[PDB]
Design a protein around this ligand. Sequence first.
Ligand SMILES: *[C@@H]1O[C@H](CO)[C@@H](O[C@@H]2O[C@H](CO)[C@@H](O[C@@H]3O[C@H](CO)[C@@H](O)[C@H](O)[C@@H]3O)[C@H](O)[C@H]2NC(C)=O)[C@H](O)[C@H]1NC(C)=O
Lengths: 213, 213, 213, 204, 212, 192
Amino acid sequence: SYVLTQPPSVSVAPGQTASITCSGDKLGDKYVSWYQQRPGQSPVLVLYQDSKRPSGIPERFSGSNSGNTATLTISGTQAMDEADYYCQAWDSSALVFGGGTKLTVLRTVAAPSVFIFPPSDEQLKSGTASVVCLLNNFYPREAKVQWKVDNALQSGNSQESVTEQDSKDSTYSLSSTLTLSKADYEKHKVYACEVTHQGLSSPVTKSFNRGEC
Amino acid sequence: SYVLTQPPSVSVAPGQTASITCSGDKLGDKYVSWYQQRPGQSPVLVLYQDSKRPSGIPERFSGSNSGNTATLTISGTQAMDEADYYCQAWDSSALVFGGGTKLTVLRTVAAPSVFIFPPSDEQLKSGTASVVCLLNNFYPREAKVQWKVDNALQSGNSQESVTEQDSKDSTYSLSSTLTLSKADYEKHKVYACEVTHQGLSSPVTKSFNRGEC
Amino acid sequence: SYVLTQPPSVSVAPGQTASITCSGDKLGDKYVSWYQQRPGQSPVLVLYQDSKRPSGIPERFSGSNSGNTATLTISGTQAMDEADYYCQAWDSSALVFGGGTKLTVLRTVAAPSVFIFPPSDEQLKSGTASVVCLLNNFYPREAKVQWKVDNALQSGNSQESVTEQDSKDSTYSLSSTLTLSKADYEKHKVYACEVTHQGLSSPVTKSFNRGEC
Amino acid sequence: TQPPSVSVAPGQTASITCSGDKLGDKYVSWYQQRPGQSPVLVLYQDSKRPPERFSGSNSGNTATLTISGTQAMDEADYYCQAWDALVFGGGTKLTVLRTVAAPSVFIFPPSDEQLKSGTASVVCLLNNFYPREAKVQWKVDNALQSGNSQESVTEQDSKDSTYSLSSTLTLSKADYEKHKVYACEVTHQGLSSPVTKSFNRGEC
Amino acid sequence: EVKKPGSSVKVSCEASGGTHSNYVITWVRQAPGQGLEWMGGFIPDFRTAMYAQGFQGRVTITADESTSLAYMELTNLRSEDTAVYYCARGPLSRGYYDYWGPGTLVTVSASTKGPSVFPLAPSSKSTSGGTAALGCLVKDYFPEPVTVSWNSGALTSGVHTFPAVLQSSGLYSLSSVVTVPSSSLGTQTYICNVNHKPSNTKVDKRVEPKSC
Amino acid sequence: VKKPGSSVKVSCYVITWVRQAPGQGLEWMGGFIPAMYAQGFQGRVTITAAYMELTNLRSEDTAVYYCARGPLSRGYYDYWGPGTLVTVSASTKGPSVFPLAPSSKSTSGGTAALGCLVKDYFPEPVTVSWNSGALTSGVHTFPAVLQSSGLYSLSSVVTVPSSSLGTQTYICNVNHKPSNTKVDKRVEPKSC
Ligand SMILES: *[C@@H]1O[C@H](CO)[C@@H](O[C@@H]2O[C@H](CO)[C@@H](O[C@@H]3O[C@H](CO)[C@@H](O)[C@H](O)[C@@H]3O)[C@H](O)[C@H]2NC(C)=O)[C@H](O)[C@H]1NC(C)=O
């Protein structure tokens, strides 16, 4: 029996190059071909006859076959290159597919930008105040916001809504509302929004006095 | 070589009887003595010749020897019986001490009794209020309180003081005081005091409305 | 308008007597009746004409009505008497239901009993070894089981199962079974089952040495 | 009136503003006071100075204290002096942050001679990283471990703020002879997710 | 199945077939976790009925003896009329209600109204970095969906539109935030374009830094 | 720690003095040319030569002084000399007793808690007795806690049978020798 071995997984960072090897016994005397498979999708050919790439695949992909190791080289890897890679070869009139290789790209950590917006003047005329604190682009999904009015932790009167990472990006974007009522917004001079997250050295607080805007 | 075996450690609650076994082949055929050693102290004699005891030892201490096992029986176990016990035996013109056995005397978990006393009607004339939440007898030291006024967890304006366990008991007593400015007390109808501790299935909260209803 | 009032909530521990009061104006002249409603069900009559009781209700229930209050007296409270009790009274040609009262029975923390059963010899011959740890008659539900094989915490390869709550006692049961291969079990020498749960001063481990017996 | 605090990264430009009506017409002096140390003048008469990283200006209603090439020894409390009687404004605090940095993790197998001595030592090393808080986990054949590993750490270099950590795992002989797969898992800020470096027993 | 607003419902209870009954039928409604209320009465033997004061105008109790069935018709349902409707039967003249029947769940879906737009003031403290975050708030509307576009759809670089969140009342809330350079805060006209098709609501709203 | 209300002196071109309370900033009082006084401390500062004297020390005078010297007519000061630290402590004030009313709701356990609260007293310690020492069962006296301002506080609590609330006289006896103070305060349930 014949077997082709590949590393279980590989890790790299954006803009770097990753090398995937499909090694074997005297594998340099055979024509290999590599298949890329995204999760939930059928495999799509990426390389046939070692290095002759098909039409449509970006030029970044490149491979070679020599000795007992055949390698696939990726340059400028991006968040769209995550997918399993499969090796192929013919032996003794028997097809052989190499073990699945999982190529992962580790995305960098970006700190959030946070703002606090007071309540519109018009809403107060309708007996309702809503202070909204926002967290701009930030990758690590784990985030925590804590509204403290006049330095008194609050809970049970806030809601959270988030979007999905941009296609050509990896950062979310979060926002939190604090639904209040008039005769409660009329007091507690100091209002604050506290956010904790990676990247930030220490929690950052953005505040605004109830008076003087 | 002659070797005796003892249990590694023994745990018993107060008011029960604890038995420690010194076992060995042909062990019961000879005379044994028990030594009690407290940490950082010269060991002392508690039993000699199975059941005979010396002066200065209370009637609680007792022991029996038979077969291939010697038992040290202690009645009225309390915190003063915390020490290590060793079994002695003679054989082949050579002494042999058994492995150390440690005695542990814990106290059963308790559940605190929590009271809340509104502020006086003589303080307010002085422009200050102080709501006090008291936790009564409870053994496990680890306890927590969380002042919630109008359903808004607070921090930074409360202190905790605790006494030491009584002589004939092992229960602490914790008091938590919340000092508020005169104006701040005039609002926030509701007041509460929450406590968490072992022996409570769920946290218990005692609250009193500001109206003194 | 005619309105009846009841305390929002009442809490008691098993074995004690709880009192619920429905208070109105000159309420002694009417013929109050009490209804018990468990969650997601239909109320069932429990008392009509103050004290009289229907057929199919335990003798514990008892009530009274005098002055300006009608009191429902419950004796020997147990876990099956947690539900909402409502007060009724006909007045001015218009039915009037009282405010909802919630009665909650506070449970008592009970420590678990932990055992470990080695893998049977015949099963070992079959080629797979299994180790099972049992915690029964414990409360609250939360409990964490952590295996150990020669001071090596185990991750994965473990199934967890929990039985239904017992109405009479309100105590669960949990079985954690560890599955290995024959050779892996044959290696290593020491096995243990660490349990951490409320009601236990310190974690308790029930270990055994394989092959010893 | 001065800002309560100012935070800037090393090598960056920071500005400290002292505000006041007619301050532009008047002059200003700046003093630096380290914790527990008497204040020392840093600038007088707007730009007059007694290194050259200090720079100040005074015009209109604001005087700016500008620093260039901020470094770890520039942290202090600054004050703005003016005459009107001597009036001293609220002090301002400046901090030198330094930025997060990921640790380069390495794993080395046990030498081929120690085995003849019946003892193996697998060492997992962490290279320069600023935030001291770090955590390593030795999981051999996918099973966490504890009680048989020691960590030693050095102090940050003079012209740097990065530590370095080495975790030595001592395995008794005839224990390293099994458990084909070894690994070292590390967690720390900057890393998006935990990174584990693993080596098979007899791969080469 | 959700009953549309302004419709009616019919709760059915067993009724005497035209002989001695020896029991008085009733009705009871229980809003979720809010207690019990009285609706109306009925005495099979005497065709007469008896309605409560609160539901005087919206209820009507009728019975049919051929089918041995009786029912009450409630019209002009509103969001406040989402609850569980019971049906009890007590003795003739004692007045305590017994043998409570299986519950019936009735639901309605609020109403339809357009959104209200309020502006979120931009940064007041001078941010020299060059990024001031604007945004208008859209809330108190029903049902899904609504669309927000900036400057008549000509600005789509940086616009964020967070998904709508279900308020406690039952309506919806939605936000929209755009980041722009600080230096271009007092020279360009920023306009929200909120459109809600079901209510045919089209409203603009200028957003400018608050005066100081 | 200097006694409050006493006087202290500081011994140090134009010579000036500046005071800096812990984490509060720099405070100027005056200068002297080998005199000028600030408006805030016009009456409590004396300059003689060179040294300066402060009188009527109070709580807020705890700070560190510095001897700074500047040119004749430059408008700036250099050569900030070593700082000299001072520490006032407080005025001695007696306690004020307030009652902690027992719960006005009957309890199935038949137990209620009473207590008198002592606060605004300096210096330590204080002693509390119930019914002239006639009651000493289930009595707790929590240790004193240093309040933020600089004074102290103390609490005492006793648990007694519920039925013994309105049929007995409970009095909190407090004595403070340093202020020769003795106050008795009755503790009774709130009227309703
Ligand atoms: C006054 O008398 C009775 C009041 O109940 C009315 O006659 C009732 O009509 C029902 C309905 O037709 C009849 O019972 C029926 O019997 C046959 C059996 O095949 C069938 O139609 C149904 O199964 C039903 O059971 C019956 O005549 C009678 N109901 C009884 C006796 O229970 C009558 O119409 C009333 N009014 C007048 C003006 O008489």
